[PDB]
Design a protein around this ligand. Structure first.
Ligand SMILES: Cc1c(Cl)cccc1OCc1cc(=O)n2nc(-c3ccccc3)nc2[nH]1
Length: 135
């Protein structure tokens, strides 16, 4: 089939987190924005309309929404208000998402395992891991 849609579509709620504060600190986020954003723990929604995929946070201070096609670079405005160039691709059934800005780079992997969606964020040496369940 084209089984990526069934694996990823839905509303996902955070259930665990490691080193996200560190990851945000590395990305440049300030001390107040980090703490609040880290507590916010928004649900994240994935939808699909043809070739166009959309990832939205539910309402949180610092709403976000991207809409993209696999392989096509696109401008994104992150939750900490960075203007980045993002490319997302499907490699192994993992969604790999690279953001470039100011000669810097961060990679965000999103993979299904069992009934769970695991999100790994890497910036320089600093690796964050967050796990989500269907809400
Ligand atoms: C929020 C944020 C801040 Cl303040 C700063 C830097 C990066 C951020 O986001 C990075 C980031 C964090 C995170 O928990 N997830 N969770 C998803 C997700 C989960 C399920 C379904 C679809 C997407 N995508 C991400 N990417």
């Amino acid at each position: 089939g084209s089984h990526m849609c069934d694996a990823f579509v839905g509303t996902w709620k955070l259930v665990s987190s490691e080193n996200f504060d560190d990851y945000m600190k590395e990305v440049g986020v300030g001390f107040a924005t980090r703490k609040v954003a880290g507590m916010a723990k928004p649900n994240m929604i994935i939808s699909v309309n043809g070739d166009v995929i959309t990832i939205k946070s539910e309402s949180t201070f610092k709403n976000t929404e991207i809409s993209f096609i696999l392989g096509q670079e696109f401008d994104e405005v992150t939750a900490d208000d960075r203007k980045v160039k993002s490319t997302i691709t499907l490699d192994g059934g993992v969604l790999v998402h690279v953001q470039k800005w100011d000669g810097k780079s961060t990679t965000i992997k999103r993979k299904r395992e069992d009934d769970k969606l695991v999100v790994e964020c890497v910036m320089k040496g600093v690796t964050s891991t967050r796990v989500y369940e269907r809400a």
